[PDB]
């Protein structure tokens, strides 16, 4: 679920930045997502958006799915069983890893998505 | 539950030390629960053992309790508000913070607790 995703983000970036910092970023991080991502981190979110889309087509509610995961060697690691739990956990762990490698750019945080996204 | 606790430990210590390093340490970290704690870290585990005993007496199974928690700016924070979930979460959050500020001394890892703990 989304609280677990936030926990994963902190795991992957070794506490370098709070997970709330990623909640409304670029064109894709946060509600909806449209246009060309504005930078590397936003590209992570576009991928994540598409993964949640694919989870939804498989009958999952990715914001709600309660999976099992472990922060090990600074990598979010899915324990979960198959199905939605495995699938959504994979979406989140992947995004967490992607966020962690990408540079955070404050100028791209909380942007006017109607003006900058398409 | 124990997996979540491991995740809290990584949250509080910014992933600087694996969770397993704390599973058999001193007289109190892990299955042990007797004698005089061997150092500052071991004292954290003594407090955590006491907390788990209190949880049990509240009717909780602390190793199993499945709570809701958020790693917020490197601080494990309980979201669960009532019952065993909130109480056990608090035990774990406090220990995770305690572990992160205590110095780890490998000479106290995996000691013979039958011999050194009373
Ligand atoms: Ca989005
Ligand atoms: Ca113990």
Curated annotation (Swiss-Prot), chains A, B:
Disulfide bonds join 11-71, 27-117, 29-45, 44-98, 51-91, 60-84, 78-89. The keyword Cell wall biogenesis/degradation does not apply. Binds 1 Ca(2+) ion. One of its GO terms (cellular component) is extracellular region. Pfam families: Phospholip_A2_1. The active site is at residues 48, 92. This is Basic phospholipase A2 PA-11.
